[PDB]
Design an enzyme around this catalytic site. Structure first.
Site, PDB file in Angstrom:
ATOM      1  N   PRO A  88       0.662  -1.214   0.159  1.00 50.77           N
ATOM      2  CA  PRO A  88      -0.006  -0.083   0.236  1.00 50.77           C
ATOM      3  C   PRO A  88       0.922   1.384  -0.125  1.00 50.77           C
ATOM      4  CG  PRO A  88      -0.183  -1.195   1.925  1.00 50.77           C
ATOM      5  CD  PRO A  88       0.262  -2.257   1.017  1.00 50.77           C
ATOM      6  N   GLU A  89       0.401   2.224  -0.644  1.00 45.54           N
ATOM      7  CA  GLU A  89       1.164   3.638  -0.881  1.00 45.54           C
ATOM      8  C   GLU A  89      -0.122   4.529  -0.347  1.00 45.54           C
ATOM      9  OE1 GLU A  89       3.014   4.023  -4.891  1.00 45.54           O
ATOM     10  OE2 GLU A  89       3.013   1.876  -5.010  1.00 45.54           O
ATOM     11  N   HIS A 131      -4.608 -14.525   8.440  1.00 48.79           N
ATOM     12  CA  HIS A 131      -3.287 -13.875   8.873  1.00 48.79           C
ATOM     13  C   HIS A 131      -3.165 -12.690   9.492  1.00 48.79           C
ATOM     14  CE1 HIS A 131      -2.324 -16.558   5.009  1.00 48.79           C
ATOM     15  NE2 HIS A 131      -1.303 -16.721   5.908  1.00 48.79           N
TER      16      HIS A 131
END
Ligand SMILES: [Zn+2]
Ligand SMILES: [Zn+2]
Lengths: 266, 266
Positions: B1-2, B81
């Protein structure tokens, strides 16, 4: 500083800290003052005591545990040997600790895994948890000196030299005889003496002596020292038989007692 | 992610956590999630974003800094997760992180000694602070490839592979040419393209790639990937000239671009 002195401190600090935000715990010793950052920025909800430890209940499920060792006491003004400061919204508490025996532990409420001494503490002497049955059991389970055992605080939390010495004299028992050597009659006398001595001490605001290293935050001296029969009275007449009180140092531990009244001496 | 994905996370979470008490941060990996106990039992006052970092401002002068990494993200439902959980009074946020690159930092507000990148980040791309003079000057001082300067983050905080690649295509500039080789007109195109792509990516809620790695908190995918011109489209037709999009790798580093449209092609 033993249970009576620490309990007096707890009672005297409540009015001065309850409801205040603990802004910061300032210090420069992360080895002695552990995880204090955890306590910062939290409102103080209560001040409890367990043994000789002071426990500040903080908003959000955290506690700041203070170990007042053998000099470490809180002051309302800084001192040359202040090692830490609890900065509140309205005032600051300074931790006076000349010999660095004091400790601070920021912990999640009730999590004392990293505080072994606090973990193994016996029941509160002045509470219903300190019952004679368990007390008697513990004594018979040990062959070590009666005095030494009491100082381990596994049978009764918060007992130190002053009150162990005064309780043993009160119960007329040798501080050096094997703990399990006590008869039910004798153990009962010590059980009562210990409880009565501690209660009286709390009522009188604790004991205040010479060095007066430990001081209450308001500076008001205790008054139990006026009831001392043997502690700090070496060479002075036993209040019961007039014989000079003896102070024997064993294994680095000093003990005051009357050889005659406590079945010892030369 | 940015920047776009993190900003979308910030915007999605704020209406859900603002004013809520962060009761606990649950996990069993103190190596990756450091000093999280500091954040426990505090109300969440704000959720800020600096570059790619998410910062939860907590009452009492504390911040819980979160770095998502390659596959990190906050979800409203637990996943196979999930590595940690932020238990709020009204609900729980789960930190999903398959590759385990994400990190959590409990810190006193502003204390980024452990997160120095957070201290040197350049101006926020979509802010008034992101100015052309500085940006241009920042490019003229480097002989390194243009794209590397877009990834530095001292020049453009929050920019990663996806948006660097997309901005470069929109501006029709080679990702591989020396940053200083750019003329001011070329720099102005890159400046404008970078800001538009990010602004657009934010509008569409970030980019959900093929791996379907990224997803908003509720689970819905982003929608900017439909606007992708070259990223993740290696071999597919450029949307401007129809030529096959290429992907050059530089020491474990892919870069998508159209050779013809972006001044390359051997
Ligand atoms: Zn006597
Ligand atoms: Zn093209």
């Amino acid at each position: 500083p033993e249970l009576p002195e620490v309990e007096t401190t707890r009672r005297r600090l409540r009015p001065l800290v309850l409801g205040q935000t603990l802004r910061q715990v300032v210090h420069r010793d992360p080895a002695r003052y552990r995880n204090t950052a955890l306590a910062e920025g939290r409102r103080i909800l209560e001040v409890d005591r367990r043994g000789k430890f002071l426990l500040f209940a903080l908003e959000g499920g955290v506690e700041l545990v203070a170990h007042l060792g053998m000099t470490g006491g809180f002051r309302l003004e800084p001192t040359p040997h202040t090692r830490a400061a609890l900065v509140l919204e309205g005032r600051t508490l300074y931790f006076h600790d000349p010999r660095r025996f004091g400790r601070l532990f920021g912990v999640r409420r009730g999590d004392y895994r990293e505080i072994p001494l606090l973990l193994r503490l016996g029941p509160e002497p002045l509470s219903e948890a300190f019952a004679f049955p368990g007390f008697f059991r513990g004594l018979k389970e040990s062959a070590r000196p009666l005095k030494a055992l009491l100082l381990d605080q596994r049978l009764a939390a918060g007992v130190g030299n002053i009150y162990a010495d005064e309780a043993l004299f009160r119960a007329r028992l040798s501080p050096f005889r094997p703990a399990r050597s006590l008869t039910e009659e004798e153990a009962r006398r010590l059980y009562r003496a210990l409880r009565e001595v501690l209660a009286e001490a709390v009522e009188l605001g604790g004991s205040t002596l010479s060095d007066q290293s430990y001081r209450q935050p308001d500076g008001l001296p205790g008054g139990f020292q006026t009831r001392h029969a043997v502690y700090g009275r070496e060479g002075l007449p036993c209040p019961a038989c007039g014989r000079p009180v003896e102070r024997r140092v064993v294994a680095g531990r000093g003990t005051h007692f009357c050889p005659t009244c406590q079945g010892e001496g030369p």
